[PDB]
Amino acid sequence: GTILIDLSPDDKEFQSVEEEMQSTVREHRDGGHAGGIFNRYNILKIQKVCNKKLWERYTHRRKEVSEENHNHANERMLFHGSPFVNAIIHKGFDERHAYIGGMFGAGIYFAENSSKSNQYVYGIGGGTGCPVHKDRSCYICHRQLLFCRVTLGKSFLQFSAMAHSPPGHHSVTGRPSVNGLALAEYVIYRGEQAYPEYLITYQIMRPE
Ligand SMILES: O=c1[nH]c(-c2ccc(O)cc2)nc2ccccc12
Ligand SMILES: [Zn+2]
Numbered sequence: 001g002t003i004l005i006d007l008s009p010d011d012k013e014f015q016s017v018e019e020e021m022q023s024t025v026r027e028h029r030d031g032g033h034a035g036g037i038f039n040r041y042n043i044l045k046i047q048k049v050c051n052k053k054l055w056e057r058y059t060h061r062r063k064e065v066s067e068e069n070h071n072h073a074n075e076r077m078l079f080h081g082s083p084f085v086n087a088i089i090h091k092g093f094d095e096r097h098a099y100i101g102g103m104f105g106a107g108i109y110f111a112e113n114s115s116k117s118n119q120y121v122y123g124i125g126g127g128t129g130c131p132v133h134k135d136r137s138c139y140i141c142h143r144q145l146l147f148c149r150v151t152l153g154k155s156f157l158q159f160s161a162m163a164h165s166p167p168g169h170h171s172v173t174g175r176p177s178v179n180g181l182a183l184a185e186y187v188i189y190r191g192e193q194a195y196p197e198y199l200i201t202y203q204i205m206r207p208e
Contacts (some may be wrong), residue, residue: 001054002090004047004199014046017147017198020077025115026181034126035119036137038204044142045201054092054195058149061192065153065170074152074170078110078186080196081117083127085144089199093191095162099124104172104187105163108194110150112183117145118204139206147198152186165189 007014022040032038066073082088084097093108100106101124111117121143122129122136129136153170161178165171170193176182188194 002049002051004089005050007046007048013048017046017200018043020147021079021114021145021200021202024079024113024183026113026183028115028119029179030119032137034136035115035121036126036139036204037207038115038137038139039207040205041114042203042205043200044203045199047199047201049089049146049196049199051089051092057092057192058151058195061190062151065151065193069153069170072153074155076110076150076152076186077197078112078148078150079114079117080108080110080146080148080194081120082146083121083123085121085146085199088146089196093194093196095191097191098162102187103160104158104174105189107162107172107187107189108191110148110186110188110194112185114145116183116185118143121145137204139204141203143202143204145200145202146196147200149195149197150186150188151193152188153193155186162189 062073126136130138130141155171155173156166156169159177172187174185
């Protein structure tokens with residue numbers, strides 16, 4: 001049911017997605033171990049993910065959440081990196097896509113910082129790096145991230161350095177409490193609460 005529509009680099013929509021990708025790169029406390037050493041990306045392609053069934057599954061859930069939270073879905077656009085990006089765009093998010101060992105429990109994790117999601121493209125901790133060169137810092141191989149529409153609803157705030165949501169909440173927010181430059185990360189416990197709206201193909205760039 002999924003079709004992928006290429007965006008032109010001249011399209012304002014390509015440009016706004018690229019800017020969110022580039023402007024939310026940060027340095028990571030692992031010195032680049034997981035995701036590689038880079039300050040910016042070479043964006044190769046941005047595709048719109050179109051699937052009627054998956055979209056309707058998302059909007060149905062979004063209405064349920066909205067109605068449980070004074071008509072406020074608290075919808076964000078967030079990054080997701082995963083070795084399962086191909087399954088996600090065809091079948092939707094579900095429990096197979098959960099980070100069982102995440103710090104907020106077994107749920108599906110999203111990041112404000114594109115570079116945080118980049119650390120998961122090749123697996124937890126960057127796994128063994130790219131398939132071809134086994135390099136977590138590969139500057140040659142093409143990587144993919146999702147830029148996703150995510151319903152947070154009433155989100156449980158965790159100050160910090162599938163399961164169920166905490167009672168009375170629809171998500172968890174991991175607020176950074178040590179690294180002053182880190183942006184928030186978020187967990188949902190229902191696959192229906194996210195839609196994989198853009199598929200971004202890119203390389204990390206070696207700093208000069
Ligand atoms: O983008 C993120 N992805 C993942 C992730 C972990 C395991 C897995 O099998 C698929 C994806 N974890 C994250 C944790 C924090 C922030 C972003 C992410
Ligand atoms: Zn490679």
